[PDB]
Write an enzyme that holds these catalytic residues in place. Structure first.
Site, PDB file in Angstrom:
ATOM      1  CG  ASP A   1      12.809  -3.341 -21.399  1.00 47.08           C
ATOM      2  OD1 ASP A   1      13.555  -2.468 -20.982  1.00 47.08           O
ATOM      3  OD2 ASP A   1      11.975  -3.181 -22.322  1.00 47.08           O
TER       4      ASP A   1
ATOM      5  CG  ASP B   1      19.794  -7.999 -20.424  1.00 44.23           C
ATOM      6  OD1 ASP B   1      20.328  -8.262 -21.535  1.00 44.23           O
ATOM      7  OD2 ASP B   1      19.197  -6.896 -20.144  1.00 44.23           O
TER       8      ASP B   1
ATOM      9  CG  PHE C   1       9.235 -14.792 -28.463  1.00 47.87           C
ATOM     10  CD1 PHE C   1       8.393 -14.537 -29.541  1.00 47.87           C
ATOM     11  CD2 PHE C   1       9.193 -16.051 -27.879  1.00 47.87           C
ATOM     12  CE1 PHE C   1       7.545 -15.517 -30.037  1.00 47.87           C
ATOM     13  CE2 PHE C   1       8.354 -17.042 -28.385  1.00 47.87           C
ATOM     14  CZ  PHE C   1       7.535 -16.777 -29.460  1.00 47.87           C
TER      15      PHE C   1
ATOM     16  CB  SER D   1       9.708  -7.627 -37.533  1.00 46.28           C
ATOM     17  OG  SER D   1       8.951  -6.497 -37.938  1.00 46.28           O
TER      18      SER D   1
ATOM     19  CE1 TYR E   1      11.670  -4.934 -33.683  1.00 44.10           C
ATOM     20  CE2 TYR E   1      10.069  -3.912 -35.147  1.00 44.10           C
ATOM     21  CZ  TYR E   1      10.484  -5.005 -34.407  1.00 44.10           C
ATOM     22  OH  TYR E   1       9.690  -6.134 -34.356  1.00 44.10           O
TER      23      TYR E   1
ATOM     24  CE  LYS F   1      13.109  -8.433 -33.779  1.00 41.94           C
ATOM     25  NZ  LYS F   1      13.287  -9.628 -32.923  1.00 41.94           N
TER      26      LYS F   1
ATOM     27  CE1 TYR G   1       7.032 -14.716 -34.913  1.00 45.68           C
ATOM     28  CE2 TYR G   1       7.593 -12.926 -33.425  1.00 45.68           C
ATOM     29  CZ  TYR G   1       7.680 -14.265 -33.780  1.00 45.68           C
ATOM     30  OH  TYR G   1       8.376 -15.136 -33.001  1.00 45.68           O
TER      31      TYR G   1
ATOM     32  CG  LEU H   1      -3.469   0.284 -33.263  1.00 48.74           C
ATOM     33  CD1 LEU H   1      -3.652   1.773 -33.014  1.00 48.74           C
ATOM     34  CD2 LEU H   1      -3.910  -0.092 -34.687  1.00 48.74           C
TER      35      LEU H   1
ATOM     36  CB  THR I   1      -1.354   9.940 -30.891  1.00 47.56           C
ATOM     37  OG1 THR I   1      -1.423  10.479 -29.564  1.00 47.56           O
ATOM     38  CG2 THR I   1      -0.858  10.991 -31.863  1.00 47.56           C
TER      39      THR I   1
ATOM     40  CG  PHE J   1       1.582   7.554 -34.813  1.00 50.67           C
ATOM     41  CD1 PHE J   1       1.551   8.741 -34.100  1.00 50.67           C
ATOM     42  CD2 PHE J   1       1.882   6.378 -34.140  1.00 50.67           C
ATOM     43  CE1 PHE J   1       1.816   8.760 -32.741  1.00 50.67           C
ATOM     44  CE2 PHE J   1       2.122   6.390 -32.777  1.00 50.67           C
ATOM     45  CZ  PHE J   1       2.064   7.584 -32.076  1.00 50.67           C
TER      46      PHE J   1
HETATM   47  N1  LIG Z   1       4.363  -7.395 -31.474  1.00 51.30           N
HETATM   48  C1  LIG Z   1       4.622  -7.147 -32.750  1.00 51.30           C
HETATM   49  O1  LIG Z   1       3.871  -6.455 -33.440  1.00 51.30           O
HETATM   50  C2  LIG Z   1       5.825  -7.765 -33.391  1.00 51.30           C
HETATM   51  C3  LIG Z   1       5.893  -7.916 -34.769  1.00 51.30           C
HETATM   52  C4  LIG Z   1       7.010  -8.492 -35.344  1.00 51.30           C
HETATM   53  C5  LIG Z   1       8.039  -8.949 -34.550  1.00 51.30           C
HETATM   54  N2  LIG Z   1       7.968  -8.820 -33.186  1.00 51.30           N
HETATM   55  C6  LIG Z   1       9.055  -9.298 -32.339  1.00 51.30           C
HETATM   56  O2  LIG Z   1       8.521 -10.350 -31.584  1.00 51.30           O
HETATM   57  C7  LIG Z   1       9.258 -10.480 -30.350  1.00 51.30           C
HETATM   58  C8  LIG Z   1       8.286 -10.509 -29.204  1.00 51.30           C
HETATM   59  O3  LIG Z   1       7.291  -9.468 -29.420  1.00 51.30           O
HETATM   60  P1  LIG Z   1       6.258  -9.129 -28.246  1.00 51.30           P
HETATM   61  O4  LIG Z   1       5.121  -8.412 -28.875  1.00 51.30           O
HETATM   62  O5  LIG Z   1       6.004 -10.384 -27.481  1.00 51.30           O
HETATM   63  O6  LIG Z   1       7.092  -8.102 -27.354  1.00 51.30           O
HETATM   64  P2  LIG Z   1       7.145  -8.035 -25.756  1.00 51.30           P
HETATM   65  O7  LIG Z   1       7.844  -6.777 -25.343  1.00 51.30           O
HETATM   66  O8  LIG Z   1       5.777  -8.339 -25.243  1.00 51.30           O
HETATM   67  O9  LIG Z   1       8.068  -9.293 -25.411  1.00 51.30           O
HETATM   68  C9  LIG Z   1       9.484  -9.206 -25.526  1.00 51.30           C
HETATM   69  C10 LIG Z   1      10.061  -9.634 -24.218  1.00 51.30           C
HETATM   70  O10 LIG Z   1      11.498  -9.550 -24.326  1.00 51.30           O
HETATM   71  C11 LIG Z   1      11.985  -9.204 -23.062  1.00 51.30           C
HETATM   72  N3  LIG Z   1      13.339  -8.708 -23.243  1.00 51.30           N
HETATM   73  C12 LIG Z   1      13.696  -7.584 -23.928  1.00 51.30           C
HETATM   74  N4  LIG Z   1      14.986  -7.411 -23.975  1.00 51.30           N
HETATM   75  C13 LIG Z   1      15.512  -8.480 -23.273  1.00 51.30           C
HETATM   76  C14 LIG Z   1      16.830  -8.837 -22.927  1.00 51.30           C
HETATM   77  N5  LIG Z   1      17.898  -8.147 -23.301  1.00 51.30           N
HETATM   78  N6  LIG Z   1      17.015  -9.999 -22.247  1.00 51.30           N
HETATM   79  C15 LIG Z   1      15.937 -10.698 -21.884  1.00 51.30           C
HETATM   80  N7  LIG Z   1      14.658 -10.433 -22.119  1.00 51.30           N
HETATM   81  C16 LIG Z   1      14.506  -9.296 -22.825  1.00 51.30           C
HETATM   82  C17 LIG Z   1      10.988  -8.168 -22.548  1.00 51.30           C
HETATM   83  O11 LIG Z   1      11.029  -7.951 -21.152  1.00 51.30           O
HETATM   84  C18 LIG Z   1       9.657  -8.775 -23.009  1.00 51.30           C
HETATM   85  O12 LIG Z   1       9.064  -9.544 -21.966  1.00 51.30           O
HETATM   86  C19 LIG Z   1      10.246  -9.311 -30.343  1.00 51.30           C
HETATM   87  O13 LIG Z   1      11.513  -9.734 -30.822  1.00 51.30           O
HETATM   88  C20 LIG Z   1       9.587  -8.315 -31.296  1.00 51.30           C
HETATM   89  O14 LIG Z   1      10.524  -7.372 -31.797  1.00 51.30           O
HETATM   90  C21 LIG Z   1       6.861  -8.250 -32.598  1.00 51.30           C
HETATM   91  O1  LIG Z   2      -0.288   4.953 -30.731  1.00 54.32           O
HETATM   92  C1  LIG Z   2      -0.247   4.414 -31.839  1.00 54.32           C
HETATM   93  C2  LIG Z   2       0.334   3.137 -32.154  1.00 54.32           C
HETATM   94  C3  LIG Z   2       0.344   2.697 -33.422  1.00 54.32           C
HETATM   95  N1  LIG Z   2      -0.228   3.402 -34.453  1.00 54.32           N
HETATM   96  C4  LIG Z   2      -0.247   2.894 -35.862  1.00 54.32           C
HETATM   97  O2  LIG Z   2      -0.901   1.636 -35.926  1.00 54.32           O
HETATM   98  C5  LIG Z   2      -0.219   0.739 -36.840  1.00 54.32           C
HETATM   99  C6  LIG Z   2       0.325  -0.428 -36.055  1.00 54.32           C
HETATM  100  O3  LIG Z   2       1.523   0.050 -35.377  1.00 54.32           O
HETATM  101  P1  LIG Z   2       2.254  -0.699 -34.194  1.00 54.32           P
HETATM  102  O4  LIG Z   2       3.248   0.177 -33.514  1.00 54.32           O
HETATM  103  O5  LIG Z   2       1.274  -1.437 -33.348  1.00 54.32           O
HETATM  104  O6  LIG Z   2       3.068  -1.745 -35.042  1.00 54.32           O
HETATM  105  P2  LIG Z   2       4.122  -1.678 -36.246  1.00 54.32           P
HETATM  106  O7  LIG Z   2       3.241  -1.684 -37.497  1.00 54.32           O
HETATM  107  O8  LIG Z   2       4.954  -0.416 -36.100  1.00 54.32           O
HETATM  108  O9  LIG Z   2       4.923  -2.973 -36.061  1.00 54.32           O
HETATM  109  C7  LIG Z   2       0.824   1.634 -37.532  1.00 54.32           C
HETATM  110  O10 LIG Z   2       0.254   2.257 -38.672  1.00 54.32           O
HETATM  111  C8  LIG Z   2       1.143   2.697 -36.468  1.00 54.32           C
HETATM  112  O11 LIG Z   2       1.558   3.952 -36.975  1.00 54.32           O
HETATM  113  C9  LIG Z   2      -0.817   4.640 -34.219  1.00 54.32           C
HETATM  114  O12 LIG Z   2      -1.295   5.330 -35.109  1.00 54.32           O
HETATM  115  N2  LIG Z   2      -0.792   5.072 -32.917  1.00 54.32           N
END
Ligand SMILES: NC(=O)c1ccc[n+]([C@@H]2O[C@H](COP(=O)([O-])OP(=O)(O)OC[C@H]3O[C@@H](n4cnc5c(N)ncnc54)[C@H](O)[C@@H]3O)[C@@H](O)[C@H]2O)c1
Ligand SMILES: O=c1ccn([C@@H]2O[C@H](COP(=O)(O)OP(=O)(O)O)[C@@H](O)[C@H]2O)c(=O)[nH]1
Ligand SMILES: NC(=O)c1ccc[n+]([C@@H]2O[C@H](COP(=O)([O-])OP(=O)(O)OC[C@H]3O[C@@H](n4cnc5c(N)ncnc54)[C@H](O)[C@@H]3O)[C@@H](O)[C@H]2O)c1
Ligand SMILES: O=c1ccn([C@@H]2O[C@H](COP(=O)(O)OP(=O)(O)O)[C@@H](O)[C@H]2O)c(=O)[nH]1
Lengths: 338, 341
Positions: A33, A60, A82, A126, A150, A154, A178, A201, A217, A219
């Site tokens: 996805d 999926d 993840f 998260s 979202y 979580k 995270y 970001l 942009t 935010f």
């Molecule tokens: N990146 C962040 O800032 C952040 C922070 C806190 C928590 N998280 C959580 O960490 C996890 C991974 O984050 P990421 O940055 O690697 O995101 P990502 O989108 O890079 O990785 C998530 C993966 O999940 C797969 N996926 C989504 N829905 C699916 C489904 N129904 N079945 C199978 N695969 C599916 C996507 O294709 C993707 O490859 C997520 O649960 C996200 O919500 C991320």
């Molecule tokens: O195009 C973008 C993406 C993110 N952000 C900001 O950058 C920080 C990190 O956001 P991100 O979506 O990467 O992660 P989140 O904190 O929502 O998990 C937050 O203050 C967002 O509002 C922003 O201003 N513009």
């Protein structure tokens, strides 16, 4: 032997590589996805000898027969989960999509896991579960309340895991909140490569830096912080990866049950500071549009590192300067991704 | 000329509510999977609705079965959906949380998505007074803090939250979240009432199960509470009055300045577990052997409704008292001791 859900994704990518390099075996399931198979081909090569112990499938989590087939042909010691949608802003616009994918996918995964007697989980949670924090650094036992769908997926899914554990004390769960992973492997052979228009970001920044998007942009500009932009605890994805291997070792410790751990650096950085960090590392200049607050955002969020230090013997060692070098190193060499 | 899909319509509250829709001039399509009911209830609603029986339709369908549900929404312009369908036993939810989350949330999300696809964005949702949690202030107002203490109660809290998210996402949706207190009783005809499959988890079906001889005893969950008799205090409402509240809610749904409102459906009076057992014993003439046991995981000490807002905005107030609740329960049970046979 480890099942890695959403392992083609950003953090999953890096964690798999760490598993492979740490002696483990890994099956990835991912519906692509927000990733492609191509990222795992690169983890394969990069992992060298150990790359023989990686195997991946386009599944999926909501396709229950497809997921059952996976657990049929392999015994899992643990699942690392993840998979999900992860964008606060997309969330507010598309709530059903998010409750569909995150909750239905995860509930199916938990069900199948139990059915096949794999009941050790590391869960991607998260900092978003802190919603809008009242208190300076967010502790594990800070008040938990979400601000957007979202965040709620979580939060709900953590509560659901607590309920599973409580129902059935065979289950061993670790919930990792995270903060804001960023960066890439320092080789620059792998990194963040989101599909579609990016939401986070720094993948947005890297793409603007390389011609793929016209501007970033920003935010919100009226926040109660020293420069008006929102503050986050940005953590090197490689540190985050390593903390998963520590979660894994923690799973069969003393008497773990359903433990939650923050994975952050404990230091807050504004969006503009991040930009400026990135520009220092890249030498490129990012055009900025200043916009209103993004629906669902907290103002200041950053981790307590104390519980994770004490119990996982884990701390982040890279700082902003490293996160941006590595990101730029991956971005330079891989401007269109994979 | 109005048309309503009723999810969980073969169930206790659904059955009674479908009947009142029919008597009310509405046309109802019911989707149930007979997980906790039988077809007999809707056969029996048909006969009892008389001429209006002609406007009832009942498909056997799981809310999680998306193709089936799409088919239903294809063939009928639904003016609104009443969503009763779900698992509801807190004791079972603690033992089997996945069953609950799965059925209750996947089920609801799939309904919300199909509804949105086919342009039917008017929802009346079966919420519950259980989301008030362990309340600080009674009576419990629609403005008071919300919270859950067990998986079942989480499915209702989470779903209310999801409805609120859906509303915020999309202002076409008009949504009433009805927090039922504790439905009790049966149609005064005696021809329909509660008939759960297997072991009833609600207090009064368990009581009537003991009274006709199916169940050896009623376990009283808590005698150490800070109530006048040390037993938990709840707000029990006649299911027939609950059903009229749905009619009130559907009418209300046709109001401009609505979007996502909570209404309590209670009586506003509290009754101990032992007072309900005493009132049933009077209605029936049966002794109910009681095992005094500990509190149930999650149970609240005292919970009763504020009726003020439902009075003002729905023009609805419960008309039946405890004696009437127990009279109709017993009128139904005496003659149908093991339910629809
Ligand atoms: N990146 C962040 O800032 C952040 C922070 C806190 C928590 N998280 C959580 O960490 C996890 C991974 O984050 P990421 O940055 O690697 O995101 P990502 O989108 O890079 O990785 C998530 C993966 O999940 C797969 N996926 C989504 N829905 C699916 C489904 N129904 N079945 C199978 N695969 C599916 C996507 O294709 C993707 O490859 C997520 O649960 C996200 O919500 C991320
Ligand atoms: O195009 C973008 C993406 C993110 N952000 C900001 O950058 C920080 C990190 O956001 P991100 O979506 O990467 O992660 P989140 O904190 O929502 O998990 C937050 O203050 C967002 O509002 C922003 O201003 N513009
Ligand atoms: N009865 C109470 O004390 C009480 C209190 C608060 C809230 N509620 C809520 O009111 C609603 C109705 O309660 P009730 O007392 O009529 O219970 P019930 O079990 O009689 O009715 C539920 C009906 O839903 C059906 N069903 C369940 N899951 C389904 C699915 N996935 N697809 C299709 N049909 C499905 C069952 O077969 C049953 O007929 C429920 O949502 C319950 O949680 C009840
Ligand atoms: O077998 C039973 C079922 C219920 N109750 C009590 O009866 C009240 C109402 O229970 P029910 O489950 O019907 O209602 P809920 O409060 O879950 O909506 C609560 O205080 C329960 O503890 C009880 O003592 N024994």
């Amino acid at each position: 032997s480890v099942l890695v859900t959403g392992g083609a994704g950003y953090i999953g990518s890096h964690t798999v590589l760490q598993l492979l390099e740490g002696g483990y075996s890994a099956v990835v399931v991912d519906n692509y996805d927000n990733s492609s198979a191509a990222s795992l081909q690169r983890v394969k090569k990069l992992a060298g000898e150990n790359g023989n112990r990686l195997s991946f499938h386009q599944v999926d989590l909501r396709d229950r027969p497809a997921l059952e087939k996976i657990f049929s042909e392999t015994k899992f010691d643990a699942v690392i989960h993840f998979a999900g949608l992860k964008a606060v802003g997309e969330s507010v616009e598309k709530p059903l999509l998010y409750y569909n994918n995150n909750i239905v996918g995860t509930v199916t995964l938990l069900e199948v896991m139990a059915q096949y007697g794999c009941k050790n989980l590391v869960f991607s949670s998260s900092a978003t579960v802190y919603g809008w924090p009242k208190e300076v650094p967010c502790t594990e036992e800070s008040p938990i309340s979400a601000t957007n769908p979202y965040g709620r997926t979580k939060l709900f899914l953590e509560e659901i895991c607590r309920d599973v554990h409580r129902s059935d004390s065979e289950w061993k769960i670790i919930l990792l909140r995270y903060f804001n992973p960023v960066g890439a492997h320092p080789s620059g052979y792998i990194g963040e490569d989101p599909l579609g228009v990016p939401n986070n970001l720094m993948p947005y920044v890297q793409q603007v830096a390389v011609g793929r998007r016209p501007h970033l942009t920003v935010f919100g500009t009226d926040y109660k912080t020293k420069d008006g932009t929102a503050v986050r605890d940005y953590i090197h994805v490689m540190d985050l990866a390593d903390g998963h291997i520590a979660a894994l070792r923690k799973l069969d410790d003393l008497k773990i049950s359903c433990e939650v751990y923050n994975l952050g650096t404990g230091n807050g950085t504004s969006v503009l500071e991040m930009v400026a960090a990135f520009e220092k590392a890249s030498g490129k200049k990012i055009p900025l549009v200043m916009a209103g607050r993004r629906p669902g955002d907290a103002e200041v969020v950053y981790a307590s590192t104390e519980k994770a230090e004490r119990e996982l013997n884990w701390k982040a060692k890279n700082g902003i300067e490293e996160m941006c070098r590595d990101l730029w190193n991956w971005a330079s060499n891989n401007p269109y991704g994979y």
